[PDB]
């Protein structure tokens, strides 16, 4: 069984690998298909154990990955796309 201290530390507001959907971040890429369609990004996740608080990023950054783009009938290739990672997270009022 997981000790309260661990359960507590492990779920407390912090940057955790999140599988983020690309069309999500780039809502403008309507006509593109990506492979992968989602990327592994550091993102603020966890709890504050306070109804009035919320986990938010205090320090952001950018990560660049090779994403294959595909525009049906037009072209297909891999290349570089950049995404926002969260480096610091903090519980702040809402």
């Amino acid at each position, epitope marked *: 069984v997981v000790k309260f201290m661990d359960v507590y530390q492990r779920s407390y507001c912090h940057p955790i690998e999140t599988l983020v959907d690309i069309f999500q971040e780039y809502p403008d890429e309507i006509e*593109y298909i990506f492979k992968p369609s989602c990327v592994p990004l550091m993102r603020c996740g966890g709890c504050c154990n306070d109804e009035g608080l919320e986990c938010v990023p205090t320090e952001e950054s950018n990560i660049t990955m090779q994403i*294959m*783009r595909i525009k049906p009938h*037009q072209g*297909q*290739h891999i290349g570089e796309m950049s995404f926002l990672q969260h480096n610091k997270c903090e519980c702040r009022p809402k």
Partner: antibody
Amino acid sequence: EVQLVESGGGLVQPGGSLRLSCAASGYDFTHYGMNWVRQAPGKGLEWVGWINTYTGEPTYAADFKRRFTFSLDTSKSTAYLQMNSLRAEDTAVYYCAKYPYYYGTSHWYFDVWGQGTLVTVSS
Amino acid sequence: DIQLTQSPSSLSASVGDRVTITCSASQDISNYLNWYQQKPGKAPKVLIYFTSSLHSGVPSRFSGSGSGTDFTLTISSLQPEDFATYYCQQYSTVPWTFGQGTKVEIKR
């Protein structure tokens, strides 16, 4: 180093068929689409179409869907262009050319080309 | 099919001269135009894409500009090795199309 090596060109009788191969090397064949361009002797460049090497889907410029067919054998990193019912006007140097690695956004230009092979249709 | 018309069709200029070649599209194509240099017996080689991005490895004397339906390729200082035929290519709407080519000859 990236390179495209085409073969299968040559003499063909009017009405005949011919298959050209484009052999890729020095990169991952399935990560970039393959285009086909032809240039009649002393003339301009004409885009024939392209094929998605990840999914297999071919897209042809209108005048070619009828007699030409694009295919691939990813296991050999090779794209093929099958031509049927050739006529004298099909006489040309045929090139295969891969799409480029992009930065942030996509631009459909051909960055590496094969050396081209002359297909001459005649009896 | 979008029609690309270049001009002039050919030209002769001296080493050191500034050469400008023109591409005119039959309809707006935004900045979706590329330029290629083709030397005798070789495949065309991309000089510029997206109207003005200089492809890596291409001498900076080559430059491109324009938009809408009018574009321009410029060689600031013609070198002996710039003898070739230059083509523009739109990627606005399939099928991709090319201009008829401009042959550039060196005058000496």
